[PDB]
Every structure is written in C-alpha cells, then in structure tokens.
From a paper:
Beyond the RNA-dependent RNA polymerase (RdRp), the L protein contains a viral homologue of the ovarian tumor domain protease (OTU) at the N-terminus. This OTU reverses posttranslational modifications by ubiquitin (Ub) and interferon (IFN) stimulated gene product 15 (ISG15). Sheep ISG15 was derivatized into a suicide inhibitor with propargylamine and incubated with KUPEV and GANV OTUs to form covalent complexes that could be used for X-ray crystallography. This yielded an atomic resolution structure of KUPEV OTU bound to the C-terminal domain of sheep ISG15 (C-sheep ISG15) solved to 2.06 Å and a low-resolution structure of GANV OTU bound to full length sheep ISG15 to 3.15 Å.
GANV and KUPEV OTUs interact with sheep ISG15 in a highly similar manner, including how GANV OTU accommodates sheep ISG15 D89 outside of the selectivity pocket. Given that both OTUs of GANV and KUPEV exhibit robust deISGylation activity towards sheep ISG15, this highlights that accommodation of D89 in the selectivity pocket is not necessary for robust OTU deISGylase activity. The most noticeable difference in the interface of the OTUs from KUPEV and GANV with sheep ISG15 is located at position 122. For GANV OTU, this position is occupied by a glutamate that is in proximity to interact with sheep ISG15’s K90. In the KUPEV OTU residue 122 is an asparagine residue, while CCHFV is unique among OTUs with an alanine at this position. These residues would not have the same potential to interact with ISG15 or Ub substrates as E122 in GANV OTU, suggesting this may partially account for the observed enhanced activity of GANV OTU towards Ub and human ISG15-7-amido-4-methylcoumarin (AMC) substrates. As anticipated, the GANV OTU E122N mutant reduced activity for human ISG15-AMC almost 10-fold, while KUPEV OTU N122E boosted activity more than 6-fold relative to WT. Despite being a variant of the same virus, GANV possesses enhanced activity towards human, camel, pig, and mouse proISG15. In GANV and CCHFV residue 80 is a lysine and arginine, respectively, which are both flexible and capable of forming an electrostatic interaction. For GANV OTU, the K80I mutant reduces human ISG15-AMC activity by half but does not affect Ub-AMC, while the helix mutant reduces both by approximately half.
Author numbering:
A (entry chain B): 2 to 156
B (entry chain A): 2 to 159
Amino acid sequence: GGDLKVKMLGGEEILVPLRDSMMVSELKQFIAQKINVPAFQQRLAHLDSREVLQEGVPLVHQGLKAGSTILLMVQNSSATLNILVRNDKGRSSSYEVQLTQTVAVLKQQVCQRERVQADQFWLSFEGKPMDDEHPLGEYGLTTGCTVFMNLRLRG
Amino acid sequence: EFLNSIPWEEVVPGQFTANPGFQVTDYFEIVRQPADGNCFYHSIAELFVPNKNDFSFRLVKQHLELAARRFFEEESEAKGLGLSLEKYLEVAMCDNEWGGSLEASMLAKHLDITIVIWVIEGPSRVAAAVKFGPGDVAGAINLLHTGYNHFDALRLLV
C-alpha cells in the first residue's frame, strides 16, 4: 500500500496509511480521530479533476495510490444548511439547521412549527430512525433531503 | 381498483405512508367502537375474530405479548423511549390502555398480516394513511383514526 498524503486547506500535509482496497469512511474516521473533527464535517476531493470522490467505492479503480494527495475541507464556521421535513399530511416545510447541534433541537423546531407535542412524533431518514442524543450529521444530511416526521398515532 | 392503485412511500422497512385526499364513507363502512381506552384492540377484533364481542379485544392483546418479546427491542419506533420491555408490558398490557402505530406494526409483523390506519382530519376527510405490512388493502385490516384519540373498524364494501 504505502502512505497516502492529504492536503488540508492547501497549507499543510498529513500522512495516512494506505490499506489497499479500503473505503473512504475509514479514511474520514482516521482523519477524525487524528484531528478531532467529526466525519460529516469533512469533504475530500481530487487534485486537478475537481470531481467528487465517490462513496462506497474503494479508491483503487478511482486511481489512487501512495504519493498521490487528496484535498481536505473542514466546514465548522459553524455553517448552516436546510432540509425539507415532511409532516404526516405531506406538507414538507423547510428547516435550516446545522450538523453540529443535536436532533433534539430539530425535534423542538418541528414541534414549534407544527404546534404538536414532542413525545408524539419521531424523525426518520432513508429507512432508519434518528436518535435524539446523537448529532445530525451522523445521518448523512444534505440540502433538500426529505426527513420524515412520523406520529406515534397513539389512540 | 382505486385502493390497490395507491402510491406508497416507504418510511422504514415494514412501514409505508401516503396522503390520499377523499372521503371515507365513499368506499368504507365505519363500524364504531367503544371509548373505553381499548378501541384499537376492539376495532382489530371486529375484523380479525369471528363473532366479535366487547371483550373479544383482550385476546388480541395476548398476541401483542408475543410480538413485544419479538420486535420491541428491534422496532424503529421504540428507540428513543427510555423504557425496557418490562416497563413497556407493565402498562401496555394493563387494562384500558391506548394503542397506536407501534402495536399495529408489531402485530402486522407478528400475525403475517397488513394493518392500515386511515387517519381523518375534519369530520370525514382523510388527512394521511399509514400502512404496516406489504399486503393488499382490500384484504387488509382497515382502521379509522377519528380525531387523534379513537379507533373504529373499516369494513370493505362490495
């Protein structure tokens, strides 16, 4: 394998072991445990093609080997974004949030916008329920993603 | 049919949602159930048990006691409650206890059936629809969520 080179902010280089045929999630987790930044707050890209580093593919046929670098971008201004959250009726409103804050904040926001209680609904994204205590970015959010609001339907 | 011709978006595996805008009585027959706190199990026993009685509901909760040990610790809705299986069953099996989407999903996965909850807002217009199971709507156990605190049975019309 060797040692891959990551170039952060275009003004520093960090070395990382090159486990042949390994995923980008472990790369982001390595950098995360190395510089104490969350994985969802990292964006990795190529040098000169400016193309998106595909996820779920081993960076092998993607054309990567030791001695080649990759650019890294950190995002905690803290930045903001906005998602579409769908009511149980279907009227998905727009909520601007941040990946750093907890899901309880988003739940209270949905409460104040729907005038409904907190214990009576839960959020979901892409076939999995969202935990309250965990951060938002751990669920892979992006602008325009439709987070579902599901009522307890207790009657 | 118009009921097999429905768009269902998947929320989690075993749970679909939709928002059809129409009136219930146009297709369904609303069998009203008592408001003793067990109207969900009453409306289930109306469609699922031969020769239903006001106390034929208890039997249905029996089935829940299996599914609770089968899917509660693995149900997508149960996460974030802060209650174990025992804290759950101590009150959920207690008489005159409400029942909602969690029990419907656990019973649909337990009984190899398909529970469809038709929630209506306003006097008689459907606001949303939640479906636990993959089965047909004509052959499903159709429930009606009048208000936000009651359940009635929905017999399918010929």
